[PDB]
Symmetry: C2
Subunit: 727 residues, 2 copies
Amino acid sequence: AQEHPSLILTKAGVEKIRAELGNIPIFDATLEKVKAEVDAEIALGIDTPLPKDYSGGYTHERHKRNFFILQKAGVLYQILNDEKYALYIKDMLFQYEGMYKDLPVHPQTRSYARGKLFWQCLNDSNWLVYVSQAYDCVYDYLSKKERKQLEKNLFRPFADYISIENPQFYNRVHNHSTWGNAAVGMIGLVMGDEELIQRALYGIEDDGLPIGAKDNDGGFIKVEGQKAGFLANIDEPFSPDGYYTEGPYAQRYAMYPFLIFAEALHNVRPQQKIFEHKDGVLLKSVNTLLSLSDADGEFFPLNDAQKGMSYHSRELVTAVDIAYHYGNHNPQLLSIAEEQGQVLLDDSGLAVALGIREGKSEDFQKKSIKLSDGANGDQGGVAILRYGNEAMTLVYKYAAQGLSHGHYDKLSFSLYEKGTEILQDYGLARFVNIEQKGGGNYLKENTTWAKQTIAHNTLVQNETSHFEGKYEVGSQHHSELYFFDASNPEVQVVSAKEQNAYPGTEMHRTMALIKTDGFEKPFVLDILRVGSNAANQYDLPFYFKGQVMQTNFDFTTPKSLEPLGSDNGYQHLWSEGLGQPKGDNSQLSWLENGRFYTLTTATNNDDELHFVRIGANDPEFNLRRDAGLIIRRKNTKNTTFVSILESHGHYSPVSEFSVNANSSISKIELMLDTKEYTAVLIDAKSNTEQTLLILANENKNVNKEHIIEIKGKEYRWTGPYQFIKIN
Amino acid sequence: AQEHPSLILTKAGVEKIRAELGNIPIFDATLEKVKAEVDAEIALGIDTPLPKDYSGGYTHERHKRNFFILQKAGVLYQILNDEKYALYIKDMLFQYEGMYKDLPVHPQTRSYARGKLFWQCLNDSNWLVYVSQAYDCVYDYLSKKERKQLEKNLFRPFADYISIENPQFYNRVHNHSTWGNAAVGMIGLVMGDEELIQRALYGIEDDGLPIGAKDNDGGFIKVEGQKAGFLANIDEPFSPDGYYTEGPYAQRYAMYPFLIFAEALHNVRPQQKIFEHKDGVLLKSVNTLLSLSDADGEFFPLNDAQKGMSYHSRELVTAVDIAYHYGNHNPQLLSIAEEQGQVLLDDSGLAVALGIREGKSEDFQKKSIKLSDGANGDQGGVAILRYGNEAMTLVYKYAAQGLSHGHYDKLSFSLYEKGTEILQDYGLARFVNIEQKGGGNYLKENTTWAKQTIAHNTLVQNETSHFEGKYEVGSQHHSELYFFDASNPEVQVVSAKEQNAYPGTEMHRTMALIKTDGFEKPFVLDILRVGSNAANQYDLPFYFKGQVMQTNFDFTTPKSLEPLGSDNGYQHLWSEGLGQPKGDNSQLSWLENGRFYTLTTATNNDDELHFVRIGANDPEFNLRRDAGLIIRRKNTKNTTFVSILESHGHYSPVSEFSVNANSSISKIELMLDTKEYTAVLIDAKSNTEQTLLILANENKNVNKEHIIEIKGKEYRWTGPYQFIKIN
Ligand SMILES: O=C(O)C1=C[C@H](O)[C@H](O)[C@H](O[C@H]2[C@H](O)[C@H](O)[C@@H](O)O[C@@H]2C(=O)O)O1
Ligand SMILES: O=C(O)C1=C[C@H](O)[C@H](O)[C@H](O[C@H]2[C@H](O)[C@H](O)[C@@H](O)O[C@@H]2C(=O)O)O1
Ligand SMILES: [Ca+2]
Ligand SMILES: [Ca+2]
Ligand SMILES: [Mg+2]
Ligand SMILES: [Mg+2]
Ligand SMILES: [Mg+2]
Ligand SMILES: [Mg+2]
């Protein structure tokens, strides 16, 4: 009784596509491009080489390309009704059938779960997700005898290999296991194998895995009390805001198996109600992911993330189209599809094409947003403050650990202006799929640099990373939201605390995005309040992008560059210059992509200002030679850092005009600096312009009245903060 | 008798413009933008502050902005027939008249010719060129009494100040003097003052200047026996190919006064035949300058050049429109005008707009080109070799000294792919008009780093710059063309020699851009043959752009960074790693803007391979932290460096696919290495792909027969080289 195809491309979908071909431009353009790709591969023949290589290498790239081409051939067969596509799928499947059973585990030994076609089970699982879709498309074209042999000798052994033979890969809450569960589930659905479908949804019972078993990136395989399978992978790593705990680079990857397998489940097993699971989180998570991109569509590089990954990727084409068709037809998704310029060649892609043709498209709104972390939304979060039409974007990370790929960077932030990074989060130390760089895999410096606290724009105590850079400790902890208030577009404030990163120390960081009179643009205000039980060394880095223009302090230029320290990331920084503050406010200004920036920070006379450059202890040139300025405050117990980051003016090498190149800050001053209250006065060099930010530190309640005095003057307000103009 | 205006905007021009307004989109759009700009400044008022500042500072930027706005107000007055513009010009001129006479020499003392309005006479001259045009536009609106006072108390004294009172500025063959000559000449022509007109054309008679005195940038003020004035500035620093000896950044700046003053001379003194002068060189030089830009229209950064200067600049808007109107109406110039998206608000800009409306536009062809240097084309040259549609561009500099801004860089090259710099020429050390960077003026490191040989991709002998970095030596010498042959678009070759850079050493460098079977793209072949009479240390830098991917040799990574040397630029390089070749060919690959590149060079086992990084002894962060690889060959007399630079493959962080990431070179071998003949064998990996280049070094005659033997086999050809496929 089951029709084929039916999981993703459906028979009713084929009919409708055919009726519309020639009058759906984005679809017609995709079809033509895909037809040319597949026809090219058909001319080259069928190559199924004996495994051997890591990423970037021939056997990896060939087997990878085969999976993409098979899924494309399948939809081409159905849409065009042209058997050359089916014959190619059939021949290729049988060539795999003739080699796969005789293969020995991948000869490369790095993976905690060595694959057969690829170095790791993750890529074997990618292959099966894509190939299942091809099989659904040729299932009726094949004879019963042919299906029986493929299922017995190719598909069933393959599905076992990436599941019951490698439970350490398959049975976790992790993007790996989501790929594995989907692979097993997609082929199960095509075949009507109820055992495999149950294994996909619920995992393996009694896996026998030992205590403390880890993956290659330092993460635990299993967590006590945690379920396995697809449904557990929806329930645990997504918050109620649709925020995926590994961060957006990983979320981007995981959306393919999440949304493909959900779509398949919706079409074949509607009683599962997969698109309702956890209050509709999968569909919601698509809007959330799109909001975690800068003005160019590039995902913010939180935790292990390669820069340049964006919503133009194949996973976001898939996610946008599926969310459009199976969700409530959000017309904002249509504008993303138009930017992508392609669609899936299936029912969901057609629906997007027709939505565009009918003039339904609306601009995707990028707004200030609060995202909770943890399954129940109580394990910290991430906040994005935006000004104007994405004119300025502040990303503040007060999240949980983030699994194996997570960084030791409680309360870090990064800053963007219209697609240009100004203060960065480093991302990963890996050149993804570039064979010549460690087989395209994680490099040693991902651990030694990238993940360490000193690499991030946040507080480092005693040259030690948050939670001593120990996964097993960090994974128990998260920062805590104090408050989020972005209702006033001119004055948006978020605040969070962290008391476990350094036991005996409390960090309370408040960030604001503020437009006020005297300034050409909004500025970022950063208040980092530190309470401790002992005198420590505190470092606060700012990793800035651009060319240094000016400072209001002197600094030394050493004749030779030495590393800043010996451990925990400090071995990777060259000491490029050492300054002493001239007064209460120190300034550093730079030029990046035609715009000037100024960092102003409240300094004491014993502060050290360290110019740094990344690149020490990097024998393979695995790290970028980016710079930073670190404020070091020695022998200090309780302290409050106060900083402003301004954007002003411009420079063009065409006109040779430099405009508004100086700061407009006259003075920043702490007026009150106690446990209960923090008050910062901001004086704008614009003649007469003064503002006062007051924070109540010990009670967040929006209806709580506060009464303080500053120089004999009473200030009275309700709620955790006030911003006032001083006249 | 003389009409006003008539120099640049003419009265028949004004009538034709008014008849066409509203049906000439590029002109209509420009008029609207300029109207809004001038109307804004009129609302702000008239400010003529007491001069104090360097470039980027308030008084410099305000007086500069006034000159641009006055010239815009003048054409607006005429075109729109609206006396608001004329009244603004009058009021501003009278405000200048009230202050100028009482002003003392600019108080900044860092110009060899301090101005009055500005720190230097160069900028006073800019002001007068622009204001002259405005005066022409309001001449009839003013009363005779008003003109008399302006002329007596502002214009005549101004013109004298920048000329007869500062002959050291005014009477040279130099871009400065071209601006000074045009300033005096433009105001002379508006006024009908024969004295000033002659002074402009023919210079100051008996100037009394010392021969051997220097300007602040280290070049000679005056050359014995050399004429002065506008005509001398056309005859002397332009070659017969329209190449301006100072290089394209400076040529760009000089075109404004050259073409503006030439246009005024054409309209007011047609008997001068200015557009025929030196065989039409001024019109020709516009094409030449456009040919000295990369695929994005950015000028190659030869000699003192700021990167990002482009044909979108105000000077090239001006040059393009004038050359179109007064030259032979070359329709290729119309495509540049379309990219610029604006035109001059005058007769020439009208002619461009009409050319575009009538569909005359044709694409500007960027070709391989040989440019001679020196007034008679015998003082070396510059070669540009291009492949395909600016797919790859090699720039080879074998020029004369280049006057004061020239670099010690005989036979250096740079390499570009579709607007991306792959191997660079550093350009200047100066942040043009950015006050915070030493007043926007040349920095100390422009002499200590930028101009030195070690900063360039060319031979350095015994850690010493060409000509010992002395202007008085280098200014007497030039490299010599051996041959240029670009007729075969697959195999283009240029060769030059230099024997005075290091007395007792001969450098013979041959560069080729070669497309052959077995390579996806054209490659650069570089043969640097060196003959000497002592054993020396030879250094060969390659300043590459991008992320290091791979080497075929081991290298050390020191625990601290030390400077590479003590003098002549080596004090600005950190030694970042030291390698020794493993074989006959050493390889370095990198990734830049999505593409891979491989440098392969013939090494002896005693060679040292130095990774370097610019930035030592740079206390104010005036230098970029770019990298290089230096080949160092010690204790060597005669040697030949052979290198290939390939472009291959692609990387995308969206798809995460790395394609064709390895070199296709199997080997390069020197088959013959004598004074008379050089032969280089290139084997591609494809196997069956082998090529041989043979150079005859002591006879360039295209009809001379050569017979040689290599490995027992006879090779016979005519002319200075042969490139043959070995079968
Ligand atoms: O194709 C891939 O192997 C791949 C693509 C994703 O974009 C992402 O880079 C993913 O990283 C893996 C990695 O290959 C290892 O399996 C391990 O470190 O886990 C990573 C992950 O969890 O995403 O790999
Ligand atoms: O506005 C300028 O001062 C200016 C514009 C040109 O683009 C170019 O940069 C030029 O440089 C001058 C410099 O200001 C000094 O006058 C001296 O060093 O000479 C340079 C030159 O001849 O170009 O300045
Ligand atoms: Ca990070
Ligand atoms: Ca140079
Ligand atoms: Mg998961
Ligand atoms: Mg942004
Ligand atoms: Mg001035
Ligand atoms: Mg470029």
